[PDB]
Design a binder for this molecule. Structure first.
Ligand SMILES: Nc1ncnc2c1ncn2[C@@H]1O[C@H](COP(=O)(O)OP(=O)(O)OP(=O)(O)O)[C@@H](O)[C@H]1O
Ligand SMILES: Nc1ncnc2c1ncn2[C@@H]1O[C@H](COP(=O)(O)OP(=O)(O)OP(=O)(O)O)[C@@H](O)[C@H]1O
Lengths: 95, 256, 263, 256, 263, 95
């Protein structure tokens, strides 16, 4: 529902179909105040990632310069299962 | 310039489609009949003709009640309605009963033949009949064509007879005109060989076109459950255009 | 494991005809449950009674306490967001494109912008394996790609109940081989709960974990596919093997022969 | 006594079939429209209306060439053919253009809706749409009904305008009557509110019946590839009987 | 064993489309010959080119010396008395009874009295196992009895060539079990020569004796079902197993997933 | 094509679709001159029995006393294969 920045933006709560419009855009403004791409994600407070949470996550990467102005870490044992199903782990720095 | 290219490709396939349907008609009628060919023609006269008897007799009455009610409202201002029995039986015999009874035959018994021969093509009954050796044009198609050329001129007469009797009901018995001047106005102005025979020859040319189209569309389908239903609207449209098209050509010759 | 759908003693009559006189089913969570039987019985009407489109007459459909028919119009519209359905022929909407087919359950339920819907369709059509086709109509689509699009439409909300209805009925062994992996893969990565209605004994014994066999209105046998063949009732034993001995017969009439005179 | 028992069983099912189609109409029109309902009505006006534009404009010309050629052959014996422009524009405006343009709309765009909603019922698109939660009456059926009530009264005017212009071609420019007495015979005898408006109200009652029947037959099919094609002849027959049936009732009221 | 039908290098084009560019087949006498392949190719048009209804364009169909197309109208009517055909959907004649269906190939070819025709139909409908039904129309006939009547019609002249066309396409394992015995039984007792077009690898490897696999216009492999799996071409090996590696692919296009921008 | 009598009617030649109308009736007149049913068949000169030859054979049994007056012997290794296919060897004295 909410996400903070600090130094590493962490996504917390649940992302499902009636909180995904402000949560996508609250993180979108974060990217443009942060240059030289250290914005690596440590998403771990997610509990019910259900492929829409992947959909807002790739859309943050779409704006980022080049095509990898970030990195993802500490996946909640289930979001990465979604990633191999869409064959996306040649495209996300999951390590 | 693709839309012009698609439009020119549309009417070239529709021209070629006429040439296949012309060669299909010369194979049916230029053949002496196979043994057993009259037993199927009597049965196919039941499906095409007798089932169409209810719609034509009822709808023929409803036009007669309209022609008697509209012809009285116009002929009462000029005060000459001894010509009411003439203009009712002259509108039907030469003009409406050849035309309207072909617009209801194209719907009820015209499109039903295209579903009947069409569903035999998707369910492979036509292809199975040929491997036995039986030719499906002579077996299936040809008793349906000859039951269409016969059953429509027998139906425009029942349309015209019920339309005049219905027009006699609202003219004489409800609006109150003279009964004797109704009938005696007919025999003066309505000849037989110029009006009743020319209303029958007009329906034989109409019965050929509403049946040769409605048979060819159900024989040259594309075998698909939604390709059949697209060829049942192709045969109501094309019949109603050739009825009204050959109307003006036959009217200009007969009454010009 | 807990049950998700508990069917408890219903009856459905389409006009002096008995379908499912008395029958009780259990759909355990996360577990592939197959329903087999002879053709003509109400197999694909059972999926419509589970899904809540046709109405029962003497029973209830239990979705975690709640009856289906007792739901309001704003809960039944919410409960149908937790269900998918892949039909017999891949019932696509032919008057609209592939991208409009997959986005149809998203736009009917949820209110999102176009830059998130067009990403979610590009993730659903990727997980099936049809990412490059997002603009063409569902004609010029091959028969092997027709059912795969309709799988992406039924899965486009992440439900917990997706009911396949004969997913391989007269298909090539290649296209049967692709679809039998996507039923295994997409279930296991999304925590689904599948229902396969089919009559194909080789795969259905080797893809299911609990098999119901309904024959004329009741259960002929149930259980894991070990004990289904070990507790073989005389109708199930003929069904799974295709034998010529049992309660369903070969001959039409047993009137000797010379007792008919062909006149 | 089985045939009388089968006949009584036939018209009881056809009576309760009316009651289902009446309750289906009260669910469509008694509802405020869903979001996006105008974008589909503009598209469904293309399929029903604009595709039907070619058959009506061409067939409307062929009746005008017949009405000018038949009305001249009768009005030349009585020697009064300054009333030629009246009887051509009086046959079309109150009688033929409401009726014939509904007998061609039932064929072309009437039966096409029954194939369109009918093929959605056998291929389970209607059942699949409901489990998502979308109600198929509001989504699929209701933009087709409102595109039928609008598109037919826009088509009888194009039928009546092309029919008079076609009748002016063979009357004035080919048979040789006076052009000024052709048009000035119209404005004396042909009012607007009694004739042109009463020819439009007659087609709104016709557009309701040729569309509510043609939608109900494609919604209450039996899902079968040869059960669809039997419901496309049920909707051409039932439309042509209710057009000619409500003809006499509306004529007796308006011109009695 | 001698060949009955020798197809030798034909081509069939239904309008700038290639079906069977160059292909040569052998139908050995008394031996079950199967033809398999992916759906959409001209499989059931090959049975029509063998049976002589559609015309070849660059080849010949050899029935013991004689070409099919070079036959007169009184030899081709005689050669079609030596052929049977069970179609895809059991193409019965719905406007006439069961007794009129089976007697239709007898009355079209031969001239016999009614007391011998009504005996021959009672022997043909007996050998299938439907001797009590001789008066009802082919509606109120079940789907399992629909194909069995159409087998009796195709066999009602004792031919030497009966070509089944997917005899079990989406049927119950009981009705599949009945029909797989009648293909074995009626062939062996009448010296037939069957052709089974199908795509069902378990029975087709265990009911046929020589299998042709056609894929896009040529043969991918042939032989007895021992050496078909031993000489496995990279397309036949994927076909008989349903694997995910070979010349027919899983994915639609290959653009990673970032080279598209969903706009 | 032809069949004799002597004391035991023997069927010879071929029975196929253009000789089966006189061959059925030539044997039918034989039955009514022969009382106390010794008319046992020793059909052995048949070479191409093709189920029509069974069809004329059962029809001789139809118009006989009771329902069984003929017994069949020495089947040409192929006609009896037809008989089990129609399940008729509870109905023909083949022994
Ligand atoms: N619209 C209908 N009206 C009346 N009876 C119907 C209708 N639809 C189906 N039935 C009958 O109800 C029964 C339901 O069986 P149904 O065909 O739905 O299951 P099925 O054979 O398994 O279907 P599928 O093979 O498509 O899964 C059938 O015997 C059918 O005859
Ligand atoms: N009437 C037709 N007009 C044009 N093309 C056709 C027609 N019928 C078939 N075709 C095309 O020719 C090809 C022939 O393949 P066909 O469908 O006959 O074999 P099949 O798929 O094995 O059939 P079945 O599955 O019924 O045995 C198909 O790809 C089809 O698209």
């Amino acid at each position: 529902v909410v996400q903070y920045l600090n130094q590493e933006l962490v996504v917390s709560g649940k992302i499902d179909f009636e909180n995904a419009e402000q949560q996508y855009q609250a993180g979108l403004a974060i990217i443009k105040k942060q240059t030289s791409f250290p914005l690596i994600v440590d998403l771990k407070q997610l509990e019910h990632g259900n492929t829409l949470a992947l959909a807002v996550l790739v859309q943050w990467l779409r704006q980022t310069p080049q095509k990898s102005g970030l990195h993802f870490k500490n996946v909640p044992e289930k979001m990465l299962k979604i990633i191999q199903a869409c064959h996306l782990q040649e495209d996300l720095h999951l390590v | 310039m693709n839309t012009i290219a698609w439009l020119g490709r549309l009417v070239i396939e529709r021209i070629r489609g006429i040439g296949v349907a012309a060669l299909m008609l010369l194979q049916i009628i230029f053949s002496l009949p196979s043994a057993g060919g009259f037993g199927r023609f009597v049965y196919q006269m039941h499906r095409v003709g007798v089932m169409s008897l209810l719609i034509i007799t009822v709808s023929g009455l409803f036009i007669g009640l309209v022609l008697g009610l509209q012809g009285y409202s116009i002929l009462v201002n000029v005060g000459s309605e001894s010509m009411l029995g003439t203009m009712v039986s002259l509108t039907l015999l030469r003009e409406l009963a050849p035309v309207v009874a072909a617009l209801l035959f194209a719907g009820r018994a015209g499109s039903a033949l295209t579903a009947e021969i069409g569903s035999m093509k998707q369910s492979e009954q036509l292809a199975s009949m040929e491997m036995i050796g039986v030719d499906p044009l002579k077996q299936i198609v040809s008793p349906r064509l000859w039951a269409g050329i016969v059953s429509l001129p027998m139906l425009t007469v029942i349309f015209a007879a019920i339309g005049i009797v219905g027009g006699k009901l609202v003219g004489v018995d409800f609006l109150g005109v003279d009964e004797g001047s109704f009938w005696s106005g007919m025999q003066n102005n309505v000849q037989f060989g110029h009006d009743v025979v020319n209303g029958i020859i007009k329906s034989i040319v109409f019965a050929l076109l509403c049946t040769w189209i409605a048979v060819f569309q159900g024989y040259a389908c594309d075998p698909t459950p939604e390709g059949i239903a697209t060829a049942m609207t192709r045969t109501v449209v094309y019949s109603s255009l050739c009825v009204l098209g050959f109307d003006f050509v036959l009217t200009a010759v007969m009454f010009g | 494991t807990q049950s998700l759908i508990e069917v408890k003693n219903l009856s459905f009559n389409r006009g002096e005809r008995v379908i499912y006189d008395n029958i009780s089913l259990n759909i355990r969570r996360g577990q592939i449950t197959a329903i087999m039987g002879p053709s003509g019985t109400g197999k694909t009407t059972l999926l419509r009674l589970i899904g809540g489109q046709l109405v029962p007459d003497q029973g209830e459909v239990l979705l975690d306490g709640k009856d289906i028919a007792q739901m309001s119009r704003q809960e039944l519209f919410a409960a149908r967001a937790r269900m998918g359905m892949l039909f017999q022929s891949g019932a696509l909407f032919t008057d609209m494109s592939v991208y409009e087919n997959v986005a149809f359950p998203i736009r009917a339920h949820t209110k999102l912008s176009e830059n998130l819907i067009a990403e979610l369709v590009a993730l659903k059509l990727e997980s099936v394996g049809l990412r490059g086709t997002e603009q063409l109509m569902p004609t010029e689509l091959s028969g092997g790609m027709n059912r795969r699009v309709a799988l992406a439409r039924a899965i486009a909300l992440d439900p917990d109940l997706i009911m396949y209805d004969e997913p391989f009925a007269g298909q090539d062994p290649i296209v049967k081989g692709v679809l039998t992996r996507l039923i295994r893969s997409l279930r296991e990565a999304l925590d689904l709960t599948t229902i396969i209605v089919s009559h194909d004994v080789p795969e259905t014994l080797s893809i299911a974990d609990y098999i119901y066999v309904v024959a004329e209105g009741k259960i002929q046998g149930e259980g894991t596919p070990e004990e289904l063949q070990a507790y073989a009732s005389p109708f199930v034993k003929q069904f799974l093997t295709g034998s010529a001995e049992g309660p369903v017969e070969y001959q039409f009439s047993h009137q000797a022969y010379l007792d008919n005179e062909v006149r």
